[PDB]
Specification:
Distance between the termini of chain A: 63 Å
Keywords: iron storage protein, Iron, Iron storage, Metal-binding
Oligomer: part of a larger assembly
Radius of gyration of chain A: 18 Å
Strand content of chain A: under 5%
Chains A, B, C, D, E, F: Ferritin
PDB class: iron storage
Shape of chain A: elongated
Order of helices and strands of chain A: HHHHH
Organism of A, B, C, D, E, F: Homo sapiens
Helix content of chain A: over 70%
Entry title: Crystal structure of human ferritin Phe167SerfsX26 mutant.
Largest interface: A-B, 31 and 30 residues
Bound molecules: calcium ion
Number of helices of chain A: 5
Chain lengths: ~160, ~160, ~160, ~160, ~160, ~160
């Protein structure tokens, strides 16, 4: 068997899509770690736990959407090993939030890079796909995380 | 450095749980690949694709429930690299259904192994955790996958008329 | 001696009724075996299993109705051992339905004999009792089994397209 | 040897089959009891109903066992069902005692099977018996005990 | 002995009655912590209610154990209920550490009663404890361990 | 130090209350035991068993109300061991009913004493609290137990 529907879908994009799916699988893992870390009796921040568990379910839906679109354009899913998270212990809330913000900026940059790759291969459908289901969702989440970081750093002194 | 709430929770079981967690993350990844494989235009088997995606999710529930209990016991979660699935293409339906039953028997074993270790370190909580949320689940799923294989094989001959009434 | 309510109930009918009870119990047991045979992972035919289980329950309702009738007349139930099913494995669906069909005919014959016995003993109640709850029930079931065998035999060949509209 | 079989000892399989026969016999006995109390010369609807429910309870019993058997890969095997120990059961207290006797025999069989299961490191079987059988017997024996006690008490002026 | 008794060793029957007492004792200590937090010089309705609940929970525990006792055929034998180890429980973090330790004690008594059941091969008892006790304890302990970490946190910067 | 809300609350009453609390706890414990005795397979009288278990809860409601009142007044709760019940086995129904009747009369007295002490220290609040929550209750509960006893004893000969 082979794909009977492929059309205007370069293998360069099909590959970068697969790489991005791994990136998301990782970011998903990293949030599974962060979520269970704040569920530790010696941390017990259920709010933050839930927050990171929700993000882990968002990244899952991210890579699941990517896979479903890979199949639609006739591409082929090619899975790699999923690297374990950067840390085993995440520190205080502000430390974890900065690690989440950096994780997202990383994903965002990967998305922007994939969209640029799509421009050069003149793949308007790929491009619309990222503009519709990804580019905004990241910009919103990064603004949400930046807002949290500012409130977190604020809960120290006078502006309690 | 032990933790407040820890009580009757062996460092052996704590490590065997972190192990079973990576095993379920693994079994999840496999079912993911399997699900998207049957979604390929050259395979197009939605019913099958759905089935493997549900199992990818039930394994997500399973490893999440393990990590929950890991914390409820004071034990600490440790994560290792998740190994990519054995194949990239899962052949025909019976080929995948067989690969699935192998994976299930593999987990069912790892479970029975963890319950054996649980009895050794006299940890009746762990033993009930597995007896209640895992052991019956896997036995029912394996019988399900067994029922499938018998019916899939039967679709290569005269008795091609399956679930009758 | 005898019961206070007993009237026109011969000892022959009474004995026959108990015998029929053993016969139906024997049947119900046979069906129970069939049901779980098709439930085996290497057979896997839920529909067939469910079909036979419902039949076992139908036989169950049969002897119960017979026993109820016994006490209503003044007779006394007398149980005997219940012989095991003639087989441990029933092969394929067509063989099972034949075994099933054969069995129903034997029961039907026994019913017909008991009806004849009641007429000979001028027992209208026994006759009506059988006419109303057993006789037609058996015919409908044999017919249904016949139909099933015919559709089964047809699944081996060209006419593999069954219930059309 | 089944495709699904895993950690299911041949001894346990044989035991489950033997247990199924036990319940089949139990069920049959209760059936006898049930209609005994329905006789026009005994006339105790309540007692009759009590034993018929029990026959149905043992029915559910063996049925759950056979299902369990298939679920594991074992293959059911049936033997004859020996008829009930009596044709007439006497008075309520006597019948209730035979019933209580019967349940204890079953409960012992259950306990033995659990023992064998623990001997063969078969957690699934242990859990299965823990979940749908053990506590069920104990609740029932206790219930029968209470009946025997109250029945005995219906002897003199303490009615 | 009991007309319905079966596989119920006297050792266990004994350890049960002993465990019942340990529960009534714990219930009593919760009744204390409860009203101590209701004091106008303490006034923490939240914590008060928390312990008042725990009280009723332990009650449900010994009422279960006793219920179980009559079923197995065992016989209940009550003892004096030792008064709470304090009349004043200090501050919330302290009251919590007390409840924590009270639970780890209760828990250990349960694990030990289970160990006994294994040895006297009483699967019914072992199930009865896995079903309604072992997990309830682990959950409650975890809950307390969280509070303790949160209370400890409500001091400085966090 | 003394409670910032204490007012017209004699330490005599304070201590009489903490005693009544212990008296009630002990009553509850008697009813607990009485209840489970009738639940035994060799006794088996669910109607009676429920009756005592209800009472064990009424008593717990009583001592809970007392402790609630103590803190309102500014008094301080003090607990002492709870003496086990008089018996392990309570015999037949009338035997257990009389023992319960005795236990009630015992508590009614302790109540009246506490009311008297209350008049003696001219604490109208405590007096009302008792009139309202315990006096009429005990009267009714006793009359009820009496009715039961009369009927139980009657269940012997001609009028059974
Ligand atoms: Ca657009
Ligand atoms: Ca269990």
């Amino acid at each position: 068997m082979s794909s009977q529907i492929r059309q205007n879908y370069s293998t360069d994009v099909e590959a970068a899509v697969n790489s991005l799916v791994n990136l998301y699988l990782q970011a998903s893992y990293t949030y599974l770690s962060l979520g269970f870390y704040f569920d530790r009796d010696d941390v017990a921040l259920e709010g933050v736990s839930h927050f990171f568990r929700e993000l882990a379910e968002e990244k899952r839906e991210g890579y699941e959407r990517l896979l479903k679109m890979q199949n639609q354009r006739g591409g082929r899913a090619l899975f790699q090993d999923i690297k374990k998270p950067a840390e085993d212990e995440w520190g205080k809330t502000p430390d974890a939030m900065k690690a989440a913000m950096a994780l997202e900026k990383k994903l965002n940059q990967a998305l922007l890079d994939l969209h640029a790759l799509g421009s050069a291969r003149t793949d308007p459908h790929l491009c619309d796909f990222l503009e519709t289901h990804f580019l905004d969702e990241e910009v919103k989440l990064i603004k949400k995380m930046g807002d949290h970081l500012t409130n977190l750093h604020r809960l120290g002194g006078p502006e309690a």
